[PDB]
Design a protein around this ligand. Structure first.
Ligand SMILES: Cc1cc2nc3c(=O)[nH]c(=O)nc-3n(C[C@H](O)[C@H](O)[C@H](O)COP(=O)(O)OP(=O)(O)OC[C@H]3O[C@@H](n4cnc5c(N)ncnc54)[C@H](O)[C@@H]3O)c2cc1C
Ligand SMILES: Cc1cc2nc3c(=O)[nH]c(=O)nc-3n(C[C@H](O)[C@H](O)[C@H](O)COP(=O)(O)OP(=O)(O)OC[C@H]3O[C@@H](n4cnc5c(N)ncnc54)[C@H](O)[C@@H]3O)c2cc1C
Lengths: 594, 590
């Protein structure tokens, strides 16, 4: 089956970064980046990422799903060719592309590392997860670990010689980390002995790397109840001798791997810690704070994973829709040389194709806009600019997490539906992308919890002020619009006004009743998402209108823009009516009446 | 953990639709079914689906089918469970008593179909194909073929298949290439490959009776040259016993996302003996009544996966403790509150609940229309029911399966990370549900049929038959029902206005039909569900106090009206944008 191989969308990625956001203008100013990345460097990095992802990584995706991982007396093996692909990936510098050059990382800004993330996850989501975990663990160690821990573990982790894991989830504890049971017993020598059971640990055990550095959430015996008793620990699979060589295997193991709907090449481990030796990261009781930066970057990364599956689905769907012939166009036969017309002639096929296209390109734009905010928070020399950026990271990362993953699933489902019956057959690859995409809505925080964060902490919690940072920039953009941009800036203004009135309705309603927050959450986040994508599409329309006639690319972009505004943006109205119904109808029945 | 929703089924048929008062003026049914007969059959369907079918769903998925030198084997326990199912009369629950079928009307066979499909969709498909094939033969085959094949097929001893699809011919059956050579003995020799054939080969039965679309050497080109043939796996002697293996077999089976215990075969006919069903060149029409009953059938498959997911999700949401209710800890004795306390978990549960109970009611309503069309003594009542069946079966197929998928996704989401683990059963229900939106006509083709044939083709008369019944219902409503009837009237108004817009916009502009199709069918669906919910609300309002079941119904109705019905506004606005934005790019610009 399949037919369609992965090709990196480098043309669209150049349009978003270089033409829309003009990131290289910003690099010139910020002297932390000025001597790390320019247009030339960035282009060569993406050119190389496209080659390794399409050439080595993508051809492993299907066979990885069909084989899955194997557990053999506590050792986990990845599908054939995974250890070899990983070695190539790590030696190329790809594990630490966004890593700190102070410990041998490449130091690329998030707008570049995010585009690399998208390429690897589109080619093979299971594969992409492995280095994503290592990069995530480096952020937490860099931000909060002691100089001794950082000097001992970070260099091998940015080089991808040593892998990372995040050991948070327990049988009774995923969302509610405050009730974890894993214990850390302080030792006289300054270390801790970690005892407990962790579940659903991605890459908790595998055969890609000689060591895995686990970040383990635990409580000291004397810790407070709840999340304010949580501490974070660095726990190596293999303890490291004084000379930096591998020494004694730590008192921890993988008990089993899970049987899953998807990302079957991603080893998902029950990890048992039996007084495993570990070192505090950050401060006692401040384990959640130790992961604050990690989670901001991981929220965007998981959003990118959802987008990535949508993009892969679309490359297969447009190739299939031009090749597969069935029936005739309703205006009459289009392929008069053939027995039937390519299925792209049919209105409903174009509706599904254009929904995928508008969501993938809008999602790609929004992922870069949020990467730009992470880069401003980190690199801006101005305190007011960094603070505005940080507040925009707090507001938008939940939206990037929940919205890109929800739209990704919708996209992968459209991509499968375009194949008809063939779409249900595994050799065509479309059914795997639905199963792969589905995890991105559940882990690194369920989408329901992402939306409770948004409405609870970022909206109610800031009096609306964090939203208004975003919606004030969109109206400033609207006030700037020429006549031609008016086609997009006018419906955008109306969407922004809808969102502002819904925000005000919610701030009023949440005063009486705390149930109002959770009731509105997921649908409010969607209203916010379609509004944000209207902003991304308006921005992309401005550039394409200016460059119209210079290249066919700009015509395609404007057509996709016009689809988004005509057919997808009106989704805000029903979502706003549903939110405005309130929580009353959610609480008419007691638990027994369900 | 699967329990048949027999109380809800009793409510829909006996309390809302008052199905026994309809059976009173259906003479051909008073001899065959009444309320007690119905209840007792459902109680038996409940036991066999829960006891012997449900336990095989997970291991069936995990094992799937195997191909060994042309022989296809189903998973461990499938043959034994099929034999028990067949011996119980369940394959022929809806079939003609003239050949040993039980003769139960569609309202009752539809509820049996719900139980088997929610227990094990893979399992449910097998008997569904046989019953489908029985409808075609009964309607169109000669007395010789009916007398020879139907009795064993209704008893479940012989299975059926539909051998339609070819590599280049799926949605477009008109471009079929399988040949039928006429023989002097009055039989045909069939040659060609069929693909994606559910139960083309398996180990459940001694014989399989294939209904194969093929063309005679002198057939006219296109769909007007297509004939239907009965092609048995094993030829049958005079004494009715098994003769020689017929000249056909299975080349391979498909590797699928879901329904993995359902054998999907590449069938090779190499001069296989067959017999004409109905008339030469009328092969497609020989399946009109079959495809009407199977469209509702695939609708019910989607609904059934949604109902199984909800039974798991509601048990999990009461048992799993995580965090504390926004208004304060309730489980004072525990480390955390049951996740049913959280607004978002209640939203996902009530969405599943409202779609499942809404789909059950609409399904029963369409089944009631198939029964009225078939058994009504007066021509005008039969004629209107036939028109509502033609209008409503694509809505039942596409809307119950689309709502089914959404329902199974909510049910997985409620389990959190556990929802992605196969042992918990939620993720299988999403993969199994997905097929129902694709086969028996893609939902896109179901939408095209609705707007293209049933609306444009009738000048909106068919939909005015439906909407007239709804407005009569509204006009009759006392003030208590007004809570539901008022927003139902506004939804009916919205649909009519959208219909008028669509009839006008389609004139001279064929692209407008396809462009509006899927989103219009959803507007229709939510309007239809609003009608079903107002009907169930009137009966629950009248019976309030008599039992907690009615308080639960009214509460579910309130959620549907407050949070789901408003979905019509955005869908209406997308439809009204027209086909223009669909046709801005040429194919190369994608
Ligand atoms: C698991 C499985 C079981 C099956 N069982 C059987 C069986 O037992 N017997 C059997 O005969 N068949 C069977 N089929 C085949 C099936 O019923 C259909 O042929 C198939 O679902 C659709 O055909 P396709 O995959 O060739 O899609 P295509 O017809 O190629 O369609 C591809 C896409 O184009 C769209 N499209 C096509 N034509 C039009 C049009 N005119 N207007 C608008 N959109 C259009 C479709 O909606 C779809 O989105 C089965 C299929 C599967 C996957
Ligand atoms: C394939 C896979 C990979 C994973 N990888 C990792 C990993 O590497 N490391 C790791 O530590 N974890 C990992 N996880 C765990 C994952 O993050 C959790 O499963 C997820 O956060 C949900 O937690 P849970 O399964 O315990 O569900 P629960 O927290 O029990 O949630 C159940 C349901 O209740 C809802 N709910 C819970 N609390 C609230 C609340 N306060 N308000 C509203 N709704 C609420 C949830 O949204 C959900 O719908 C992985 C999971 C899987 C399946």
């Amino acid at each position: 089956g399949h037919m369609a191989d992965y090709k990196a969308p480098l043309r669209d990625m150049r349009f978003v970064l270089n033409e829309v956001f003009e990131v290289s203008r910003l690099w010139a100013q910020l002297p932390a980046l000025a001597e790390v990345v320019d247009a030339e460097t960035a282009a060569a990095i993406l050119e190389e990422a496209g080659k390794v992802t399409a050439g080595t990584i993508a051809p492993l995706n299907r066979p990885g799903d069909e084989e899955g991982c194997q557990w053999n007396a506590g050792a986990v093996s990845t599908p054939a060719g995974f250890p070899e692909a990983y070695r190539t990936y790590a030696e190329g510098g790809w594990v630490g592309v966004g890593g700190d050059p102070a410990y041998g990382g490449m130091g690329m800004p998030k707008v570049i590392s995010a585009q690399v993330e998208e390429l690897v996850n589109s080619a093979n989501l299971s594969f992409g997860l492995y280095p994503m975990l290592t990069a995530g663990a480096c952020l937490a160690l860099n931000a909060h670990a002691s100089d001794e821990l950082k000097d001992k573990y970070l260099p091998n982790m940015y080089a991808g010689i040593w892998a990372g894991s995040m050991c948070l989830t327990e049988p009774h504890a995923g969302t509610d980390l405050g009730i974890i049971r894993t214990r850390a017993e302080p030792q006289a020598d300054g270390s801790y002995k970690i005892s407990g059971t962790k579940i659903f640990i991605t890459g908790g055990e595998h055969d890609l790397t000689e060591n895995i550095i686990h970040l383990v959430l635990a409580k000291l015996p004397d810790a407070p109840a709840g999340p304010k008793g949580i501490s974070l620990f660095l726990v190596p699979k293999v303890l490291v001798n004084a000379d930096g060589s591998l020494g004694e295997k730590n008192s921890l193991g993988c008990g089993s791997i899970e049987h899953k709907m998807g990302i079957k090449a991603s080893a998902t481990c029950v990890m048992n810690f039996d007084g495993a030796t570990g070192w505090l990261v950050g401060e006692v009781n401040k384990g959640l704070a130790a992961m604050f930066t990690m989670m901001n970057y991981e929220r965007l990364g998981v959003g990118i994973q959802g987008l990535a599956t949508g993009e892969r689905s679309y490359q297969s769907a447009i190739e299939y829709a031009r090749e597969r012939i069935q029936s005739r166009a309703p205006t009459g036969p289009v392929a008069k040389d053939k027995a039937a017309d390519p299925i792209i002639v049919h209105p409903d096929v174009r509706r599904m194709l254009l929904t995928m296209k508008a969501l993938n390109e809008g999602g790609r734009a929004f992922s870069s806009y949020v990467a730009m905010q992470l880069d401003t928070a980190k690199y801006s020399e101005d305190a007011v600019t960094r603070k505005r950026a940080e507040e925009l990271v707090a507001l938008l990362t939940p939206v990037a997490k929940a919205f890109l993953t929800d739209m990704g699933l919708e996209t992968t489902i459209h991509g499968q539906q375009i194949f008809g019956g063939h779409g249900f057959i595994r050799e065509w690859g479309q059914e795997q992308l639905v199963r792969d995409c589905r995890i991105t809505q559940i882990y690194e925080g369920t989408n329901g919890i992402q939306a409770l964060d948004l409405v609870g902490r970022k909206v109610i919690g800031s009096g609306g002020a964090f939203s208004r940072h975003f919606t004030d920039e969109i109206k400033a953009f609207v006030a700037s619009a020429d006549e031609a941009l008016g086609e997009f800036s006018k419906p955008l203004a109306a969407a922004v006004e809808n969102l502002e009135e819904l925000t005000a309705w919610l701030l009023d309603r949440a005063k009486g009743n705390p149930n109002e927050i959770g009731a509105a959450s997921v649908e409010y986040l969607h209203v916010f998402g379609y509004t944000a994508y209207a902003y991304m599409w308006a921005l992309m329309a401005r550039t394409a209108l200016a460059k119209q006639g210079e290249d066919d690319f700009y015509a395609s972009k404007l057509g996709t823009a016009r689809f988004y505004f005509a057919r997808l943006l009106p989704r805000i109205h029903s979502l706003s009516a549903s939110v405005r119904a309130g929580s009353e109808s959610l609480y008419l029945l007691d638990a027994e009446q369900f």
